């Protein structure tokens, strides 16, 4: 609960919602419809109160952006591209090209969506 950005997930009957824990709050994609989010490749973020339902991945953490920018994105209701493929993610995380705050948040949003989408595959 001090500027730490850890990956966490909420598991309801095997379907997983992923989010970023900062303090006593969770940032996640504002969607209960993963079909439409995935098909459109677009989402905004929301911030909710952390609860015991959330499971922290203490060895995972997405430190790609400053939290204030994500707070601003939540407040502004900005709609991000969350459909980057592995090549784009790989270039972003293993390369040295400039990465805007919007691109950085879109990257983390892609990771959240992809992780949640993979949990749906029956």
UniProtKB/Swiss-Prot annotation:
Subcellular location: Host cytoplasm; Host nucleus, Host nucleolus
LRAT domain mapped to chain residues: 7-101
Annotated catalytic residues: 17, 86
Role this protein plays: Is not a protease.
Domain notes from UniProt: Contains a H-NC box.
This protein's name: Protein 2A H-NC
Source organism of the structure: Human parechovirus 1 (strain Harris) (HPeV-1)
Residue numbers of the full-length protein present here: 781 to 902 of 2180
């Amino acid at each position: 609960q001090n500027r730490m950005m850890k990956l966490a997930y909420l598991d309801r009957g095997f379907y997983k919602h992923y989010g970023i824990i900062v303090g006593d709050h969770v940032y996640q994609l504002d969607s209960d419809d993963i079909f439409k989010t995935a098909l459109t490749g677009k989402a905004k973020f929301t911030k909710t109160k952390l609860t015991s339902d959330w499971v922290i991945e203490e060895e995972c953490e997405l430190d790609y952006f400053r939290i204030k920018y994500l707070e601003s994105a939540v407040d502004s209701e900005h709609i991000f591209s969350v459909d980057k493929n592995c090549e784009t993610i790989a270039k972003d995380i293993f390369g040295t090209h400039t990465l805007s705050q919007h691109q950085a948040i879109g990257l983390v949003g892609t990771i959240l969506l992809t992780a949640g989408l993979m949990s749906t595959i029956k």
